[PDB]
Amino acid sequence: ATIHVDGKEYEVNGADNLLEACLSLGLDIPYFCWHPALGSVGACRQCAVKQYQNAEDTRGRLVMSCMTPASDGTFISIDDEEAKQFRESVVEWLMTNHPHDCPVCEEGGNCHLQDMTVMTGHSFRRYRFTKRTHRNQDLGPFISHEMNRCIACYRCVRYYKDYAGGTDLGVYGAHDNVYFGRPEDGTLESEFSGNLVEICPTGVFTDKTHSERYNRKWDMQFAPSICQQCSIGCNISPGERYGELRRIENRYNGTVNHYFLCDRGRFGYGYVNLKDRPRQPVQRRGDDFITLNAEQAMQGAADILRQSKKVIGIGSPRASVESNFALRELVGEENFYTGIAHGEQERLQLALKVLREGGIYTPALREIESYDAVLVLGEDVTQTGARVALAVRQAVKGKAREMAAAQKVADWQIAAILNIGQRAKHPLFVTNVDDTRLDDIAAWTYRAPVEDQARLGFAIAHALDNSAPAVDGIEPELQSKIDVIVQALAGAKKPLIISGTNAGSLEVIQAAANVAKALKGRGADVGITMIARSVNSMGLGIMGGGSLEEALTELETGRADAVVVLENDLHRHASATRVNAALAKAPLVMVVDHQRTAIMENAHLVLSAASFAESDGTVINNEGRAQRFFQVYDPAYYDSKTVMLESWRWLHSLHSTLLSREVDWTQLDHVIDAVVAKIPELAGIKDAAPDATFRIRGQKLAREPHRYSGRTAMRANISVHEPRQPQDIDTMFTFSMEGNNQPTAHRSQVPFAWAPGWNSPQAWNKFQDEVGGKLRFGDPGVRLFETSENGLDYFTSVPARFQPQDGKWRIAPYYHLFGSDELSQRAPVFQSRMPQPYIKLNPADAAKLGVNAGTRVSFSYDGNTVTLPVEIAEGLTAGQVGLPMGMSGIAPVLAGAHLEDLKEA
Amino acid sequence: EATEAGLLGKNIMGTGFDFELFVHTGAGRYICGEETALINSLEGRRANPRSKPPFPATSGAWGKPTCVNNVETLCNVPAILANGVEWYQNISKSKDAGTKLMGFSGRVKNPGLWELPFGTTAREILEDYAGGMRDGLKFKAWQPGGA
Amino acid sequence: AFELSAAEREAIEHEMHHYEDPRAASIEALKIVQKQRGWVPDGAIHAIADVLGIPASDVEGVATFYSQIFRQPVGRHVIRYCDSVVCHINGYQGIQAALEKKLNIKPGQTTFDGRFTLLPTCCLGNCDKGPNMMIDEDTHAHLTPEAIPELLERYK
Numbered sequence A: 001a002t003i004h005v006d007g008k009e010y011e012v013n014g015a016d017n018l019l020e021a022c023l024s025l026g027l028d029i030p031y032f033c034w035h036p037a038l039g040s041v042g043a044c045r046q047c048a049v050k051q052y053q054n055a056e057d058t059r060g061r062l063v064m065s066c067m068t069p070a071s072d073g074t075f076i077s078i079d080d081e082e083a084k085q086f087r088e089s090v091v092e093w094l095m096t097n098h099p100h101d102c103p104v105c106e107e108g109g110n111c112h113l114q115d116m117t118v119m120t121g122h123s124f125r126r127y128r129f130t131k132r133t134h135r136n137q138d139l140g141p142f143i144s145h146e147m148n149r150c151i152a153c154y155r156c157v158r159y160y161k162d163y164a165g166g167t168d169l170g171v172y173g174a175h176d177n178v179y180f181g182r183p184e185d186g187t188l189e190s191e192f193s194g195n196l197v198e199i200c201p202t203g204v205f206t207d208k209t210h211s212e213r214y215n216r217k218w219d220m221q222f223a224p225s226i227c228q229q230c231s232i233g234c235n236i237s238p239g240e241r242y243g244e245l246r247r248i249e250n251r252y253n254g255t256v257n258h259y260f261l262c263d264r265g266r267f268g269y270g271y272v273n274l275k276d277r278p279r280q281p282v283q284r285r286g287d288d289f290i291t292l293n294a295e296q297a298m299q300g301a302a303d304i305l306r307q308s309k310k311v312i313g314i315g316s317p318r319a320s321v322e323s324n325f326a327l328r329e330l331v332g333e334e335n336f337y338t339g340i341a342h343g344e345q346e347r348l349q350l351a352l353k354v355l356r357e358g359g360i361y362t363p364a365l366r367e368i369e370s371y372d373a374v375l376v377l378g379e380d381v382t383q384t385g386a387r388v389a390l391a392v393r394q395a396v397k398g399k400a401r402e403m404a405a406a407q408k409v410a411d412w413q414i415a416a417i418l419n420i421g422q423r424a425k426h427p428l429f430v431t432n433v434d435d436t437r438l439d440d441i442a443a444w445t446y447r448a449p450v451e452d453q454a455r456l457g458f459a460i461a462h463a464l465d466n467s468a469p470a471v472d473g474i475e476p477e478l479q480s481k482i483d484v485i486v487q488a489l490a491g492a493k494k495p496l497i498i499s500g501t502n503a504g505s506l507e508v509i510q511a512a513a514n515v516a517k518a519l520k521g522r523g524a525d526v527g528i529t530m531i532a533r534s535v536n537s538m539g540l541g542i543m544g545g546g547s548l549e550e551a552l553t554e555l556e557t558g559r560a561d562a563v564v565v566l567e568n569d570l571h572r573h574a575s576a577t578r579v580n581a582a583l584a585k586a587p588l589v590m591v592v593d594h595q596r597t598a599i600m601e602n603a604h605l606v607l608s609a610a611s612f613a614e615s616d617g618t619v620i621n622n623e624g625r626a627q628r629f630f631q632v633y634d635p636a637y638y639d640s641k642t643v644m645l646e647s648w649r650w651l652h653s654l655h656s657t658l659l660s661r662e663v664d665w666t667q668l669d670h671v672i673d674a675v676v677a678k679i680p681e682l683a684g685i686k687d688a689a690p691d692a693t694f695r696i697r698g699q700k701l702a703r704e705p706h707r708y709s710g711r712t713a714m715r716a717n718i719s720v721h722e723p724r725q726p727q728d729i730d731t732m733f734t735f736s737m738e739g740n741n742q743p744t745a746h747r748s749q750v751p752f753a754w755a756p757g758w759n760s761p762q763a764w765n766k767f768q769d770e771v772g773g774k775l776r777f778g779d780p781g782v783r784l785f786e787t788s789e790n791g792l793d794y795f796t797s798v799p800a801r802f803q804p805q806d807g808k809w810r811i812a813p814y815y816h817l818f819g820s821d822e823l824s825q826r827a828p829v830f831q832s833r834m835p836q837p838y839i840k841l842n843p844a845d846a847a848k849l850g851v852n853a854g855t856r857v858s859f860s861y862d863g864n865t866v867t868l869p870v871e872i873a874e875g876l877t878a879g880q881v882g883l884p885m886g887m888s889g890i891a892p893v894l895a896g897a898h899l900e901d902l903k904e905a
Numbered sequence B: 001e002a003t004e005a006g007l008l009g010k011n012i013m014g015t016g017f018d019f020e021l022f023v024h025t026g027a028g029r030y031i032c033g034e035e036t037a038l039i040n041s042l043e044g045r046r047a048n049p050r051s052k053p054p055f056p057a058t059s060g061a062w063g064k065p066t067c068v069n070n071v072e073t074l075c076n077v078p079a080i081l082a083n084g085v086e087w088y089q090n091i092s093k094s095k096d097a098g099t100k101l102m103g104f105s106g107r108v109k110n111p112g113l114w115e116l117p118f119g120t121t122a123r124e125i126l127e128d129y130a131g132g133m134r135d136g137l138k139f140k141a142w143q144p145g146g147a
Numbered sequence C: 001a002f003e004l005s006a007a008e009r010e011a012i013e014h015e016m017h018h019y020e021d022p023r024a025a026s027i028e029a030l031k032i033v034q035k036q037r038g039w040v041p042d043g044a045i046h047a048i049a050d051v052l053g054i055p056a057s058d059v060e061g062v063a064t065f066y067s068q069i070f071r072q073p074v075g076r077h078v079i080r081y082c083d084s085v086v087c088h089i090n091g092y093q094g095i096q097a098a099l100e101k102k103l104n105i106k107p108g109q110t111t112f113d114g115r116f117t118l119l120p121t122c123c124l125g126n127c128d129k130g131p132n133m134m135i136d137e138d139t140h141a142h143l144t145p146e147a148i149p150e151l152l153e154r155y156k
């Protein structure tokens, strides 16, 4: 297509509208109601341009560029006089009722309405009458509501309802009294409600957790990082001020998590600011905890380790690839253990083997939205991999997109698409132990134990391909529903099979692999997705090592006297009594961690590791994508006594002091080169980010905006002398504003979006090749493995049907977005949001045991009687008991385990 | 009555055409009279209008082809199909065919409504049919077709 | 607190039979509840949402969009006087002043005994017989300020 804007000629896409085409060309058109992910509706009337019929047309006509297709030979004018006056008048009409609130507004300096008011040139008020006002609502602990600042752009309701599928937000009232909010006071129920603080162009919806410790955007120190709260690997921009983590902003990645986070990643950063975090190396002596600096801690640990006969290491999926590799080099490959349980490790390696040996392509998170049928087996994705659930919702709405495309309706005209596709949707079949949050759009939901879900998967695979093993004992109703699933999956152009390790069953993963193989054998374009548990679960699986049970056995027999535990609390993956006994028997326990854990009471040495905000490293995605996260701030900049080093720095210095009796800390690129040298499967982490010598025309990449304030006052209460700027030898970023953050800079890692005239999250438009697409020079992060040429064989181990045994209760896992993750549940803002720990009972089982709802029952697991109140679960199959994994006292390793002596307290 | 007489429902007049007629009572908003907002309010939603294209003829009520017509247009239809097209063209020598309900309201002598052919003078309606203005009142303005 | 009666639920489902989408019966469900109880409370919003299978936010947005669905308690009789242009020409302000003098309330309020609630309303489609009033289901035309007390005392 060819368009002529203001006399200049441009080549654009004809399938795009004029607003997105002109924004992709660098032209500035003000807009409110349009969003790249939400489509065009024509509400705010801000994007007005003057369209002419041909080249010899002088009158023209004002049209909305978001509602006008960028067809071939289209003549428009942005800088036309009448269009400029109309856009200024739209800004003025919005300004008539807007409150005098900018100094006490959390959106100030980050506000799209401020930027568009300045951009249109409106600065003079001639409206003299009263402004309408509104009462606010309580929206829960995360989102603060200020209804006075609304411009009625309908972005919130469109995102929350049409995109995110939420039900408790809406627009109420009439003409100029339109109210956007909930029908009553209460917490927003959506798992993706936190994206409202960037979707809303004004300060109506603000980050309440940030509002507690508010600072402006220009005062922030940003870094490009990876969210640590599950395996999905969403790109984030942590922003700090005065030595504490203050906000998590969405960092655009056109391949992974483009505009949207989930609420866990956005609001579960509060564990970084906990005051009980270790900040110095601490050595115990008798009952005295003496504080050491880094050098003498390294020397004492090196001599004590050298006096030992065998040192073993226990890694964690919390830690990065570099930290786990440094531990593996410190103790040796034969003495390195992964730190997760044996069954968890087996499920993780099975998922990994399906990913890089199953011969079936695994899609990225953005690519999930293009699949025409989804089968989810055992993985409650909303509570474990929430952004995958959001992408599955988009893939489900793909059917309405298809029927609209058949009627020659443009893909950005979202209201017409939704009107054509009323309730027709792509097939979604979710299986779980109970009801999921995806059941509102699912074509079918299967509530059954994990062996029954695996049997359903194997039956689907056998009905798709007769070479797959069959399942004996299928009821005709279940057989008919299996036939419905098979007819839906066979007729799909792009079927997608999603599973994961959170179900706690190996056979569910095997059944999902068999379904994917059966769909691959029919020539379909089948994709497979595996949801891991933690941020670097797949990297720990790729690196490998022994299980936690083997390390505990080595400590308990006495073959190992020294144990180094890296970023692992050890109670989520093993029984607490066994861990306590093994660590009390061990004469030397060293714990390298950034959070106060229960195993630090028995620790001889505690090394204060850095969290993700204070460390660099690489983490491996659930789809096998290596992604580098960068340090946000120096923890020793304000508190000079703080010795909080990177975990790989601690372990490399420990290995150097053990070998040559001298301290060499490290550089990060040296550890990365060591990883790609000793481990060839992790050789792709070299290309995840450029090294520390990378420059943009000779200068580093800036971590803070150019108007960063208080450079001679922020530390003045400690010392009037300004300290040295912290040096970053690890990465290409500088801990200052003396750097580059140009949107045209040839790089992939962007710490924050800012452009002149665009101070809001709409500044991400300038950093993309086309708006809503990819980053201009490619998205960061590379895939570790490609699709294998040949797949796996059919798994013939079909599990038997679930049989309830008397006195034994099979534990059905119930994951929660707020609580099941360890670090996020340590955050103080998650304590109010997470619920009380209930235990789920079938009505028949509760009636047999004589307990109603809310009554406390006590059960013994591993010789430990704990009591929980009973919640009646209708969908849970009898013979099962429901437990919330990841909570305090209920380890995620309990999923799939049995349970004895369920007695009323 | 029409359903009892076989003029509505299943197999109307033995043709095989099935048609049922419902009456949806409104809830008091003026914007509901706009045709796309009418379609939105018929679907049980807030009566916001829709952007055209697409027109309701291709995707209207519940995404189906839909035609919205005024009461008086549908009342003009049966006379056209019972008396002929040429009769409808041969009742007024104007560019707008057929008759139209025209009236005058306000402080006139006889406010009301009369069926008149197109091309009727507004002064003719005001004086002959409405009776002119009331006693002691002088005409100063008029609105031809509503608010 | 709120619970839909059997007649209300039956009428709502019968209205649900008339449409392709059950969401299309939301306006008439709100009107059924309003006819039974005078207005629509919040539990009615949740109950209608549960019956129709749509979220309560959509039901509340519909209820607060339309002016004739009352989300606040009203009196026993709703006086609705036309304040549009033809009735402004025909002198609705004298009728409004007479109503405010007889009832001692502002437009939009309810009398102390809960007997009358006064509301301005848009044009009633009776402009040739203006000024016009609409008490609960009865339209009264050719209004005069002297006939207002006679017209108001037949609604006990």
Ligand SMILES: Cc1cc2nc3c(=O)[nH]c(=O)nc-3n(C[C@H](O)[C@H](O)[C@H](O)COP(=O)(O)O)c2cc1C
Pocket (backbone or CB within 6 Å): B030, B031, B032, B033, B034, B035, B036, B068, B069, B070, B071, B073
């Ligand atoms: C604000 C607005 C209100 C309208 N109200 C009505 C109305 O009350 N009755 C009506 O028949 N048309 C109304 N219309 C016109 C309709 O959009 C549409 O033209 C008409 O209902 C059907 O078209 P027809 O005249 O060809 O039959 C309204 C239009 C607008 C913009």
Ligand code: SF4
Pocket (backbone or CB within 6 Å): A098, A099, A100, A101, A102, A105, A106, A107, A108, A109, A111, A112, A113, A114, A149, A201, A202, A203, A204
């Ligand atoms: S929303 Fe924007 S324009 Fe409105 S008060 Fe806040 S900063 Fe100012």
Ligand code: SF4
Pocket (backbone or CB within 6 Å): A149, A150, A151, A152, A153, A154, A155, A156, A157, A180, A199, A200, A201, A202, A204, A205
């Ligand atoms: S609350 Fe925010 S997103 Fe919603 S309509 Fe108002 S300004 Fe737009």
Ligand code: SF4
Pocket (backbone or CB within 6 Å): A227, A228, A229, A230, A231, A232, A233, A234, A257, A261, A262, A263, A264, A265, A266, A384, A385, A386, A387, A388
């Ligand atoms: S989906 Fe996972 S990686 Fe993404 S924001 Fe949520 S917790 Fe973080």
Ligand code: FES
Pocket (backbone or CB within 6 Å): A019, A030, A031, A032, A033, A034, A041, A042, A043, A044, A045, A046, A047, A064, A065, A066, A067
């Ligand atoms: S952005 Fe086009 S009208 Fe709102």
Ligand code: FES
Pocket (backbone or CB within 6 Å): C082, C083, C084, C085, C086, C087, C088, C122, C123, C124, C125, C126, C127, C130, C131, C132
């Ligand atoms: S103007 Fe009052 S009835 Fe029409």
Ligand SMILES: [Ca+2]
Pocket (backbone or CB within 6 Å): A614, A615, A616, A631, A728, A730, A731
């Ligand atoms: Ca560093």
